[PDB]
Paper text:
The photosynthetic reaction center (RC) of the purple bacterium Cereibacter sphaeroides (recently renamed from Rhodobacter sphaeroides) is a photosensitive membrane pigment-protein complex that serves as a convenient and informative test model for studying the mechanisms of electron transfer, photosynthesis, and pigment-protein interactions. The RC from С. sphaeroides consists of three protein subunits and ten cofactors arranged in two membrane-spanning branches, A and B. The RC contains two bacteriochlorophylls (BChl), PA and PB, combined into a special pair P, two monomeric BChls, BA and BB, two bacteriopheophytins (BPhe), HA and HB, two quinones, a non-heme Fe atom, and a spheroidene molecule. Of the three protein subunits of C. sphaeroides RC, M and L, are pseudosymmetric with respect to each other and have 5 transmembrane α-helices, whereas subunit H has only one transmembrane α-helix, which is mostly located outside the membrane on the cytoplasmic side. Here we present an approach for stabilization of the photosynthetic reaction center of Cereibacter sphaeroides, which is the formation of disulfide bonds between its α-helices.
In the inter-subunit mutants V(M84)C+G(L278)C and G(M19)C+T(L214)C (pairs 1 and 5, respectively), the electron density for the S-S bonds was visible but of poor quality and detectable only with a low cutoff. At the same time, no alternative conformations for these cysteine residues were visible either. To provide additional confirmation of the formation of these disulfide bonds, SDS-PAGE was used. For the mutant form V(M84)C+G(L278)C, the same picture is obtained: in the gel without beta-mercaptoethanol, the formation of the LM complex is observed (line 7), and in the presence of beta-mercaptoethanol, the complex breaks down and three bands, each corresponding to one of the RC subunits, become visible (line 8). However, it was observed that the mutations between the L and M subunits (G(М19)С+T(L214)C and V(M84)C+G(L278)C) significantly contributed to the stabilization of the RC.
Residue numbers in the entry:
A (entry chain M): 1 to 302
B (entry chain L): 1 to 281
C (entry chain H): 11 to 260
């Protein structure tokens, strides 16, 4: 048959790669980890090393404390019975203060006080994690595109749990820490606001979410179609166009009449995915604050 | 016109049907046998969408809607006005999409490249056929397929979801969503990594794939690599659409209750997990 | 109404973004030419972008794009038709001439380098400490063309050192000289390596490398363009699918 470049035929292994140095403080890099033959069928086989800075450790600390605050309260709801805590894992829920507390931090622990505690731990896990993806790229001399894109996901997460609840007046507006309960929250939200399908930002957000799947499907398959020409060495094809990059452009030009470059496909890529949570955050932010019924709203306007 | 490097690639050959009888371009576009076929299908289907639009009265493109025949019409044909036009449009649309895939096959063959792109497109086509052919035929009526309107197809989603309660509890819907999110996540990261290497801090030299690995090894302790990221992206995108078509090929065929009722398996399993004290017992 | 303001503003924002993105993707290939090489009249509604420069590592120069576009190689094609839009037929052997799906691009005649200034790709015998770590070791296996004859034997693997992955097979020919076969164009089997793209007789015409321990970017484009091009040009000599399935039990 014909090799499709989905799975590696032959794995090769050399002395362990400690990585590029640049201005990374190597005092903070772990040693190389093991190799995984399973992982090397699809991607790289080598694990590690990892960098553990102050920011990374602070992030993993608060990330654990957030996780452990739901974990303590889930054990609690399960009547401290192990067999019960396993069967109802997906139905447990750590829930925000009741609507009458407004934005007060006076909630009793068992009535949304523990929710405010878990949130503070997640607020600090995420924001210190964001700082780590700026610093890791800075230490290497790279651009900050990753940290700027991670800002788009942080925007929607900050709107759901922080920005909208304050503008509305209560912490009850926020999302519960529960596996099934946060799906239930998502459903009630659409109902209460007059069919989120009529929020034109929810419409844009879906278009971009479909489009990201569309776009990565085209681009991943395009690059795989031309891996026979070194096509996945995209950095060197940016600096010195190969026949890989030329056949890729021309597949798309002959198909849909326009086409990209080996560098600007990645600009389409970043913006496709980042507009998902940018539009989405705007849509959610206008709900209950500026618009109460999206369906009724859209009949008036346009 | 041509890109400055295009001419050396515009040679004869690669067709599947018709020799060189259609082996030519129109501007940037390649035609081939299936450019003709695609044109035939889409133009026919568009003509019929217009015909169905004048039977309805309006020319506003947000109001035009071609509905499937009613449920009582089972799996047979219906008159043009009462569902029949939908049925021919579905055939043309299917003919356009399939021909579009095969035209890409011709283009691949001329350019000497893998067939990954049309193959990935077939996953989108098969998802579409799940909603208008495989699921309706399995349910006994074309009337279970979605209508062709910009807002009515949305109301189909809402009506169909709320028929089985909260669709979120559909476990295959859960998986499909996880793939759509992880695809968007991975797409953002992959564009950002390449751009951050190609465009370092002002005044510095272009980075290398070695820096890209180091960045991700530093940040999370693993880097999938430049080839693995493109494989992952395709698999994530195709897995999302696969578990999408699956979540409906079972919805109203292998299962017809509220979808929340599926998760009471482990709870109320024949091992009688009495285990009181919690909400589930 | 503020929501109207917001959605209205986002659509003005989106139009500008698509403008920026499309002009960004015009740094290669543009401005459009006619089928003879001269500038084309209608260039589209998008202007070229303001230039940008890459500083390449290891003092290899800069690159400013968009810049003037010249193929910088022989193109052994010929215009078939009078009006624009028809194929350009090969004037000779397109496999040897490197046109159509055998095409290559006049890239720099130096090797790609890792982050340390070393050759990115080397044979395993000259890459310190590299070995096969999973899968069928293809070294020693006979190498079979799509006409189902044996064309040579694997004598080494060429490895991407920083990325730890196989990129070429080194195949010794009957004359005792070797060639490189793209890893993505070969199937590695229990008792052979099968190459669908090439009949056994076109192996000798694979373009050769000038140094037996490095491969330059230009050499890579020549080797890979050729192998890929056998798909279209070697079809006369490609046995059928059942013919290959039967070849197993021979
Ligand atoms: C409310 C929503 C708030 C949302 C909160 C957070 C938003 C996060 C945005 C996500 C950005 C991800 C994309 C990153 C990117 O491409 O930038 C690379 C770049 C990284 O560069 P580098 O690492 O230093 O590399 C150096 C290179 O040499 C040189 O770098 P380079 O070449 O690699 O990058 C250059 C890049 C620079 O990137 C940016 O400019 C990013 C800008 C982010 C803006 C966020 C959107 C705001 C939403 C407004 C919508 C209104 C609705 C209300 O160029 C662009 O992307 C240009 C922007 C496109 C211009 C389009 C103009 C539209 C106007 C239309 C008018 C005409 C229409 C007529 C009809 O990042 C930035 O520019 C940072 C932007 C930070 C924005 C934070 C937002 C604050 C909150
Ligand atoms: C996929 C799962 C569901 C579904 C659920 C939703 C939901 C929920 C929403 C949409 C929305 C949209 N859907 Mg729908 N939709 C389905 C089936 C389809 C099919 C199809 C033939 O199968 C098509 C073509 C569309 C098309 C569209 C667009 C009108 C819109 C933006 C999507 C987007 O950018 O996607 C990614 C594709 C691209 C980025 C490429 C560009 C494609 C363009 C935009 C298609 C235009 C279609 C045109 C108006 C109608 C056919 C035109 C012919 C020429 C006659 N839907 C099925 C039933 N769809 C969103 C919206 O805003 O609706 C009003 C929205 O909120
Ligand atoms: C009945 C339910 C309603 C509905 C109600 C809602 C509501 C409510 C919301 C959405 C949202 C979304 N909906 Mg809707 N929606 C419905 C119907 C649909 C349909 C469909 C076919 O029917 C589709 C495809 C969509 C599509 C979408 C997406 C475009 C969008 C979410 C983007 C995203 O990736 O978020 C996922 C990404 C994030 C949440 C960002 C995460 C960032 C943080 C920082 C991550 C932290 C990780 C943490 C530390 C954990 C660490 C773990 C360890 C490291 C392992 N909707 C119907 C009408 N939908 C959202 C939106 O934007 O609306 C405008 C939203 O709030
Ligand atoms: C109230 C509604 C219910 C609900 C009920 C449903 C229903 C009902 C459906 C889904 C389906 C989906 N839902 Mg749900 N769902 C809800 C809430 C959500 C939320 C959320 C955050 O709340 C999310 C993220 C999702 C996510 C999703 C996806 C898994 C899936 C949609 C994509 C898909 O399959 O595309 C597949 C892609 C396609 C069908 C595209 C095909 C494109 C074709 C091949 C080509 C078109 C070409 C075009 C005509 C060209 C135009 C011209 C050119 C532009 C020039 N749902 C709520 C609770 N969900 C759908 C599904 O699984 O469908 C299979 C579905 O039908
Ligand atoms: C642009 C939109 C998309 C996006 C973007 C995005 N997200 C990002 C980035 C970007 C560009 C990053 O830079 C950043 C990152 O570093 O990615 C690798 C991140 C990331 N996005 C993530 C998640 C995420 N993104 C999401 C969505 C999206 N992200 C969008 C689709 C979602 C959802 C809901 O769809 C999630 C859940 C993280 C993986 C990461 C941010 C990590 C972070 O802030 O972490 C702090 C928390 C901790 C350090 C630790 C907490 C503790 C654990 C929960 C413990 C439990 C473990 C358990 C006990 C072990 C079980 C083991 C088994 C093997 C048994
Ligand atoms: C499998 C994963 C993802 C995927 C893959 C994918 N799609 C692809 C490709 C790939 C790899 C292509 O190569 C192909 C392409 O060439 O893209 C530029 C394509 C493509 N994906 C498209 C759309 C699309 N893909 C989508 C999704 C995705 N595509 C998946 C998430 C979606 C949605 C809703 O999620 C849409 C809208 C097109 C942009 C393009 C194919 C163009 C094509 O087939 O053209 C021929 C047909 C016509 C020009 C018109 C026919 C018109 C009909 C006869 C009348 C209209 C009928 C229709 C039923 C009406 C619907 C009304 C709506 C309101 C519902
Ligand atoms: C690394 O490489 C890569 C490139 O290159 C270097 C690329 O370019 C691309 C391509 C990617 C882009 C250009 C990014 C932007 C693309 C998207 C956002 C994806 C969605 C695209 C669209 C919305 C456009 C869809 C347009 C279509 C379907 C064309 C419309 C069709 C016509 C008007 C005519 C069609 C022709 C026919 C019917 C037959 C020919 C004509 C006759 C008359 C016969 C990728 C993926 C890539 O990975
Ligand atoms: C054996 O078990 C042990 C004890 C070891 C465990 O630890 C087990 C642990 C578990 C079972 C944990 C289970 C956890 C979950 C199921 C969590 C699932 C989480 C979700 C579904 C997340 C929902 C989305 C959350 C969002 C959108 C949050 C946004 C919040 C922002 C942080 C808001 C900003 C900050 C605020 C409001 C804090 C304000 C307070 C200040 C002091 C500033
Ligand atoms: C995305 C998956 C993340 C997996 C994290 C892998 C981190 C491995 C760290 C290697 C540690 C090696 N050593 C010798 C220090 O133990
Ligand atoms: C998404 C990561 C998945 C990694 C797991 C890979 C699965 C193993 C597939 C083995 C293929 C080996 N073989 C024989 C085809 O070469
Ligand atoms: C907005 C999403 C749907 C857009 C429809 C397709 C856009 C046209 C792009 C094809 C360009 C062909 N052209 C004119 C460059 O030759
Ligand atoms: C950066 C990529 C840009 C692609 C543009 C996609 C636009 C989708 C338009 C869908 C229309 C949605 N809406 C609001 C009319 O309901
Ligand atoms: C919804 C995404 C929109 C895709 C269309 C973007 C631009 C298409 C037109 C490109 C012009 C081609 N041209 C003339 C420069 O060669
Ligand atoms: Fe890429």
């Amino acid at each position: 048959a014909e090799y499709q470049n989905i799975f590696t035929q032959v794995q090769v292994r050399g002395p362990a790669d400690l990585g590029m140095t640049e201005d990374v403080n190597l005092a903070n890099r772990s040693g190389v980890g093991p190799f995984s033959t399973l992982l090397g069928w699809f991607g790289n086989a080598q694990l590690g090393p990892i960098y553990l800075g102050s920011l990374g450790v602070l992030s993993l600390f608060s990330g654990l404390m957030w996780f452990f605050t739901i974990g303590i309260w889930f054990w609690y709801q399960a009547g401290w019975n192990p067999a019960c805590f396993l069967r109802d894992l997906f139905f447990f829920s750590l829930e925000p203060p009741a609507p009458e507390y407004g934005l007060s931090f006076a909630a009793p622990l068992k009535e949304g006080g523990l929710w405010l505690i878990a949130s503070f731990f997640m607020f600090v896990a995420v924001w210190s994690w964001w700082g780590r993806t700026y610093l890791r790229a800075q230490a290497l001399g790279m651009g900050k595109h990753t940290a700027w894109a991670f800002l788009s996901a942080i925007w929607l997460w900050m709107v759901l749990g922080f920005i909208r609840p304050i503008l509305m007046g209560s912490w009850s507006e926020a999302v519960p820490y529960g596996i099934f309960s946060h799906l239930d929250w998502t459903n009630n939200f659409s109902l209460v606001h007059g069919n989120l399908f009529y929020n034109p930002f929810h419409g844009l957000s879906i278009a971009f979410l479909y489009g990201s799947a569309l776009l990565f499907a085209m681009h991943g398959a395009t690059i795989l179609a031309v891996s026979r020409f070194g096509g996945e060495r995209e950095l060197e094809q940016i600096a010195d166009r190969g026949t890989a990059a030329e056949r890729a452009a021309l597949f798309w030009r002959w198909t849909m009449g326009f086409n990209a470059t080996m560098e600007g496909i990645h600009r389409w890529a970043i913006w496709m995915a980042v507009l998902v949570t940018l539009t989405g955050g705007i849509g959610i932010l206008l709900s209950g604050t500026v618009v109460d019924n999206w369906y009724v709203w859209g009949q008036n306007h346009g | 016109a041509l890109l400055s490097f295009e001419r050396k690639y515009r040679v004869p050959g690669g067709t599947l049907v018709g020799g060189n009888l259609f082996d030519f371009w129109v501007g940037p576009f390649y035609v081939g046998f299936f450019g003709v076929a695609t044109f035939f299908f889409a133009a026919l289907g568009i003509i019929l969408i217009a015909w169905s639009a004048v039977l309805q009265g309006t020319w506003n493109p947000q109001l035009i809607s071609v509905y499937p025949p009613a449920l009582e019409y089972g799996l047979g044909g219906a008159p043009l006005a009462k569902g029949g036009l939908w049925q021919i449009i579905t055939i043309c649309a299917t003919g356009a999409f399939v021909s579009w895939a095969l035209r890409e096959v011709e283009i691949c063959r001329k350019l000497g490249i893998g067939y990954h792109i049309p193959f990935a497109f077939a996953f989108a086509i098969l998802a579409y056929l799940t909603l208008v052919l495989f699921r309706p035929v399995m349910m006994g009526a074309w009337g279970y397929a979605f209508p062709y309107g910009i807002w009515t197809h949305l109301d189909w989603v809402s009506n169909t979801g709320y028929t089985y309660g909260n669709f979120h509890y559909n476990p295959a819907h859960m998986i499909a969503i996880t793939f759509f999110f992880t695809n968007a996540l991975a797409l953002a990261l992959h564009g950002a990594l390449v751009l951050s290497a190609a465009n370092p801090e002002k005044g510095k030299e272009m980075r290398t794939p070695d820096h890209e690995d180091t960045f991700f090894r530093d940040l999370v302790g693993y880097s999938i690599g430049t080839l693995g990221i493109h494989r992952l992206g395709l698999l994530l995108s195709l897995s999302a659409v696969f578990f999408s078509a699956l979540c409906m090929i079972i919805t109203g065929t292998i299962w017809f209750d509220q979808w929340v009722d599926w998760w009471q398996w482990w709870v109320k399993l024949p091992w009688w997990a009495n285990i009181p004290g919690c909400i589930n017992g | 109404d503020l929501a109207s303001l917001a959605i209205y503003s986002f659509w003005i924002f989106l139009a500008g973004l698509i403008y920026y993105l499309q002009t960004e993707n015009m740094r290669e290939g543009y401005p459009l030419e006619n089928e003879d090489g001269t500038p084309a009249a209608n260039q589209g509604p998008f202007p070229l972008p303001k230039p940008k420069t890459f500083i390449l590592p290891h003092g290899r120069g800069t690159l400013t794009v968009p810049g003037p576009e010249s193929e910088d190689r022989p193109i052994a094609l010929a215009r078939t038709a009078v009006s624009e839009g028809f194929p350009h037929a090969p004037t000779g052997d397109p496999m040897k001439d490197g046109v159509g799906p055998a095409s290559w691009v006049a890239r720099r005649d130096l090797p790609e380098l890792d982050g340390h200034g070393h050759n990115k790709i080397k044979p395993m015998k000259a890459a310190a400490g590299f070995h096969v770590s999973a899968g069928k070791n293809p070294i020693g296996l006979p190498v079979r063309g799509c006409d189902l004859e044996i064309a040579g034997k694997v004598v080494d693997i060429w490895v991407d050192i920083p990325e730890q992955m196989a990129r070429f097979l080194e195949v010794e020919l009957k004359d005792g000289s070797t060639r490189l076969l793209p890893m993505q164009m070969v199937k590695v089997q229990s008792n052979r390596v099968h190459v669908n793209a090439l009949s056994s007789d076109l192996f000798a015409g694979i373009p050769t490398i000038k140094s037996p321990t490095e491969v330059t970017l230009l050499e890579e484009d020549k080797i890979c363009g050729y192998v890929a091009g056998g798909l279209m040009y070697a079809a006369p000599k490609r046995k059928s699918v059942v013919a290959a399935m039967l070849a197993e039990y021979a």
